Amino acid sequence: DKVVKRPEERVKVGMTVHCRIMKIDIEKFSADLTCRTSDLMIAHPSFHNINFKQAEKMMETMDQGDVIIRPSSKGENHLTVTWKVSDGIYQHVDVRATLWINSEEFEDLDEIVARYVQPMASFARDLLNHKYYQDCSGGDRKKLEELLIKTKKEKPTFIPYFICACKELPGKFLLGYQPRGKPRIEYVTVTPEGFRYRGQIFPTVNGLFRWFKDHYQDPV
């Protein structure tokens, strides 16, 4: 400021303003202090140095298998791992889905996902390509029941089956069937090592199907 209003923002009037000193004029009654601040001077693991509502706006673009790690919103020294499950379904593993781990893993986070999300993600994707697969608007309990009774009429003898994933409780597949003219629902969990059906854990994905196609004949 030369022929304009005196510099008030650059230099604190009445108070002390920090600026770089580029002149030694103590004896000459001079202070070359700079008012300007500048004078003083598939499987793509991303990162995030974010809230929950806004984070969802950047999840529907990436394809299945792209895992993203973000901080938590419950306490301190916590992380949340989010891996793509289906169209709109996302499991938010809130690591203290109580996944117990040690503290040394904090330094290197390149193995937590490769040890508990990658195999789980592959197992989850294996069901996506299933022959009898459907979504029915996120797999709602009110819409998945009418389909069974509407599909039994076309083939009373043959009793087909379907698989879907819920939206309110991610990570719980619904495997329904019609033993008679009465619907029934059975959930199933996908563990990091495999699945959890009737309490048993299978090593491979096909094992669950092979064991399921030989146990639903009982009267229950």
């Binding site: 503290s103 040394e104 904090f106 330094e107």
Partner: protein
């Protein structure tokens, strides 16, 4: 009244567990090795550092098996626990020196009986 020379200690300390210089040294070394790992941990204090460098300058032997063997060959005798630490740590050359330093040994055992033990300890030293 508390004088280790005459083998008297408080009741609480009487039931203590003696430790050797090498024993404490390796214990502290292992504790340091454990603490250095597991990042995001409060680092050691000057007390730990000074104790480490104090015990490291008197490690007569590094082998835990050496420690075990010496304590095993010593415990077979009738000496009190207090006699297990000082005698095993100082490692005197001669029975006369050992007896002079520790007045308890005066008249407690024979000269050759102690000298053989001292020689064995010296040999056990690395």
């Amino acid at each position: 009244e508390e004088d280790a020379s005459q083998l008297i200690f408080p009741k609480e300390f009487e039931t203590a567990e003696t430790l050797l210089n090498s024993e404490v040294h390796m214990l502290l070394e292992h504790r340091k090795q454990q603490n250095e790992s597991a990042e995001d941990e409060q680092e050691l204090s000057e007390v730990f550092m000074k104790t480490l460098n104090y015990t490291a300058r008197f490690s007569r032997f590094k082998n835990r098996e050496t420690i075990a063997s010496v304590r095993s060959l010593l415990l077979q005798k009738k000496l009190h626990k207090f006699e297990l630490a000082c005698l095993a740590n100082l490692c005197p050359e001669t029975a006369e020196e050992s007896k002079a330093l520790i007045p308890s040994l005066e008249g407690r055992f024979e000269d050759e009986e102690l000298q053989q033990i001292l020689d064995d300890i010296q040999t056990k030293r690395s």
